[PDB]
Symmetry: C3
Subunit: 477 residues, 3 copies
């Protein structure tokens, strides 16, 4: 025994147990148990998952499409008001239908009869819900080997997989102590929203929160009601309202969020995403290292040793994607373990040249002898150059094993956001109260002066982003 253990209720903890602290950190460490009678324990496979949930609320009203509803023949103003309250869609969600009414001269039912202008719900596109902060779940598989072959396995987790936080592995016992953090980020759930409908795979879909907000503002804040007033006024026809105005926001709002908007939606098929059928986002990277206490009962005078294989990293290839200003690109490297032993290889970007910034952390992978792994790191690009929209540069990829390392340079290319569309014109009034006109140049980064208008002239739009110097109601006569 290294530290003596006592217990009145457990024979295991009174019988010469000793405690070993082990972190599942992608290392090659093997815990060799000696009673002779060689047994070894090792952590092989690890995974991080994020489990999400959703929340509805009265503030998050349903996404609905609307049609116009018109009827005439009401005898009195009160009749029209009652019909609106009873049979028209409740735009403001106050319990009564919303609508407008107009009186018209009636010889048969004098002095007036009344018309009503209303909406009516056609269909519900989705019930929205907030997306809550996720729980972080780990899994870590521990393996027992008598000799060459694995003879027993156990998977530990703070979630529902495996045997849980404490389990038996042969005659030893493994107990979770908590997780050490790696510094990796989680996806931002606040920019997206959940959309529930049986039309969607698994019954719901991830939407963009801004689109939903704009829909809600439009339908419930008065703009839809203003469309009813405009229809009543003759500014719009009923067909115009229905076809072009009233449902645009709803129909945009139920679209799935773009992959650029959130890591919770996969761009490519192989990329991970938030599975709406399981509420799980399987992070491509480890977010923490779980730490364990291993209680080993190896009898009287039983001891432990550690076997640590080491490998040799060899970079086989490198690649990079175009980095577009405003979105991070990627630098990738394929690394092979050319050594005879298992390796623990930490890949990272160690530098990037001017204009390029590393916006990622390192990643460590367990690599078997003769096997290969691929690394991927996020690189961001920014520039204020007015001369070149495309800029070439370099970043350094480094992979460190425990014993040896390898590094190489990787070319990267940055693409600026355009400042203007080539050929488009812009106008400006100077301190001398005179208008100036400029044209966007071919590189989409600068404007070049064209002309300054005279004192009595003004720079006036001509359509298709053109302006001209000139020294608006014919229907008003």
């Amino acid at each position: 025994d290294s530290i003596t253990y006592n217990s009145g209720t457990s024979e295991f903890f009174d019988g010469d147990v000793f405690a070993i602290e082990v972190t599942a950190d992608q290392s090659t460490d093997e815990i060799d148990i000696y009673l002779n009678q060689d047994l070894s324990i090792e952590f092989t496979h690890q995974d991080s998952k994020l489990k999400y949930s959703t929340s509805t609320s009265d503030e998050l009203r349903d996404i609905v499409t609307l049609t116009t509803y018109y009827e005439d023949g009401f005898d009195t103003e009160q009749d029209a008001i009652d019909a609106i309250k009873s049979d028209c869609y409740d735009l403001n969600q106050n319990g009564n239908g919303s609508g407008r009414y107009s009186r018209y001269y009636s010889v048969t039912s004098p002095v007036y009869d009344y018309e009503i202008y209303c909406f009516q719900k056609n269909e519900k596109l989705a019930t929205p819900a907030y997306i809550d902060n996720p729980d972080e779940i780990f899994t870590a598989k521990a393996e027992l080997q008598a000799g060459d072959k694995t003879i027993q396995s156990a998977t530990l987790s703070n979630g529902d997989a495996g045997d849980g936080t404490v389990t038996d592995l042969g005659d030893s016992k493994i107990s979770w102590n908590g997780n050490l953090d790696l510094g990796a980020s989680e996806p931002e759930n606040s920019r997206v929203i959940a959309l529930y409908s049986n039309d969607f795979e698994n019954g719901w879909r991830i939407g963009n929160k801004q689109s939903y907000e704009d829909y809600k503002t439009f339908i419930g804040g008065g703009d839809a009601y203003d469309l009813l007033i405009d229809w009543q006024d003759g500014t719009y026809t009923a067909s115009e309202v229905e076809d072009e105005l009233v449902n645009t926001d709803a129909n945009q709002a139920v679209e799935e969020a773009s992959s650029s908007t959130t890591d919770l939606v996969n761009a490519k098929v192989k990329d991970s995403s938030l599975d709406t059928g399981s509420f799980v986002y399987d992070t491509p990277e480890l977010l923490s290292y779980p730490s364990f206490t291993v209680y080993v009962d190896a009898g009287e005078n039983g001891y432990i040793e550690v076997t640590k294989p080491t490998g040799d990293p060899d970079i086989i290839s490198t690649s990079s994607t175009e980095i577009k200003e405003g979105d991070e690109g990627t630098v990738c490297a394929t690394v092979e373990n050319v050594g005879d032993g298992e390796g623990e290889f930490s890949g990272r970007l160690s530098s990037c040249g001017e204009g390029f910034s590393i916006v990622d952390d390192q990643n460590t992978k367990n690599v078997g002898a003769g096997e290969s792994v691929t690394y991927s790191f996020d690189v961001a690009f920014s520039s204020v150059s007015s001369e070149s929209k495309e800029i070439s540069g370099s970043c350094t990829f480094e992979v460190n094993g425990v014993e040896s390392s390898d590094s190489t340079s990787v070319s990267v290319t940055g693409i600026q956001q355009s400042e203007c569309n080539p050929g488009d014109q812009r106008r400006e009034k100077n301190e001398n109260d005179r208008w100036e006109i400029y044209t966007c140049q071919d590189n989409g980064l600068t404007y070049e002066y064209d002309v300054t208008c005279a004192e009595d002239e003004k720079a006036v739009a001509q359509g298709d982003n053109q302006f001209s110097c000139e020294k608006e109601h014919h229907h008003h006569h």
Copy 2:
């Protein structure tokens, strides 16, 4: 077993040795032997989240408004000046906002002028962002002579207790940092603080969406449009004041619903963000703090560990109806029927089809003969068109270090409705002809009713009904 040296401290120049201890709800007792019944133990732990707020010019005050009208202005400039000086500044540009109209005046020809304005009535609240919280831990360490505690110390990274380092008898305890459990925190981005002496402790948690819509309305132009409509005769002043202008303001100061945020308590017993202390007392532990215990037990002083174990017995189980879009809960009450203190990790180990575990495990320290209750979040999703209620089961597991118990719990899932039974919908088929469908009794599907002729259209009739009408709406024009 490791020698410590120091020129400035006699404590660290003596025969001290360092022990690593994590406050993890275990039963471990650190037995101290001089060369004698002394034991050190961690008994009670708590996690708290401390919040703050941030104001900003962008977050304008929540105010209610009335209309302001006056006439008799002699010139257009007089009216403009009066508006700039005496009217509410809707757009926050330093000058009052308003509209003016000229009217024929014999006494002051050619015209006099009216003004249409708002005026502030009351300030309902000053809004503020809610910041990310600091996570505070407390952990109580006890020193026992025999079975009785002779000294206690509370360690914390906040204001409670003695802080991160304290003396406990002849020993010293030093915080090293916290190990993470993976549990989530509440989402502060959905909510805002609303400051007013009308509110308990001077502020309240509001819904951020409601405030955003209020701000959009008052400062984005819609209130100004109400002034234009009042000027035009579309509305009267009374209508504006009573039904239009203050609706968003009054909605925005309402407290956020419990469904919106964990920071507002559903039940009296449930925790929430106390506005009088800025503290949210999390119902579960968020991390395990790690400590170094420096023991000075003389020249030949050594340590042992005593580890009691218990026996989990599930006494009862419970579950709430799970409504699609909001997680429900499955609960279990567990008794320690053994003779020793226990460390019981509860979890859900599985759920049947349609149900997803969206929670992590919970570990509780349970005294002999005592009972604790666990609670885990379960989410439900379905695309069935045949059944609104779906039954299933989840498995609750409780693992002690030595033994375990498990049981199954029935759960019921309820879908969101896709439509209201009896409501109708209209659609144009592939043959460019209108079709009408009726929502079925189960509120999940629509069934075909009829197809309109080519010259006909599916036209709303009020109360969610449609009819085919020949196409061949302004009697007041």
Copy 3:
């Protein structure tokens, strides 16, 4: 102490042993002894926490543009006007077609009517917006090896690009990162802000307020700008009025940099840290975690380890506090000197605050050399419902604990309430008897005092400048 074996590494095949060390601002030194001297010592010197941010664009985040009006006449038919609007006018709602209004007018030469169009045209792009993503947390920790009193080797460990990375050699020893222990400190809220890309801004982009951008986007694409076209068509506004006062207000507000009060990512003071847009790094003023290390020491067959732990003596030399304004945290600071002869590990904190004041910060531990001084800073929040005093005085206690000794002191703090009203402004309300009452805001800006009740036939009517009057029971131009 623990036997190691390896077929591929000579370092791990001998009699190396592993030491667990956390870079936690302590004074601990790992003293290495060969045989059973040759004293080598390892210590961690400098640590830092940084947050690395990135951005994300999206079709939903449309460009921030300024607009002008575009008018043209002479179109022969309604269809000509419709096509011209779709082809040559700015697409307000981003549906692929230009947006605009048209009006018919009597034409003698082209009967019966010709047509006018009312449109917007893009003038300039002010910025391309992007979301700001959650950051990665990067640590650096410097390890030093000293022979005698001289440092002979240094190594910097990190989970990012600095130093040698997660594993490095230090002399004959090896240091391996195991992960970080969390301190509980908060990170800035990225959801309140947005990135604004333009070569007009330092390093090509700027941190903006997300609410301002949201309002701009709602206005331009949600119909309000289109309503301005309708109003211009109606004669309610002129083209010059639209252009100069209405259409570009939200865009120009949206490109302003976020205020320091909105986000910690924008520095209040010049010396205060912020999200550097040229490097995407926010250097947090405090440590966010303690990195944990395994140190493999190969000290031969009889090599052993000892720890030397210096201790200091805290002495508070000064304190300070800022005015705490209800709704924003203020700060309490203390300057502490180590008046002892040895290096110290000093944990500063606020241990209490009086009524109305709440500590909303965690402790801070700093390594302080003998004779050196450090300053601590802690956030304190203030809230009150007092109707009598806008200013409330109180106190907080600053405590600094070394490993061996401690010091404490009281710091005066001042809380300022938000005003409930502006003095002199009036308010109106209907009582249980459905009759109007008028109240005036008092000099302290917290309460209203009753002034008068209007008669049954009267109403409390606005009169300008926040005043109300009772008037008997509004369109002369109709």
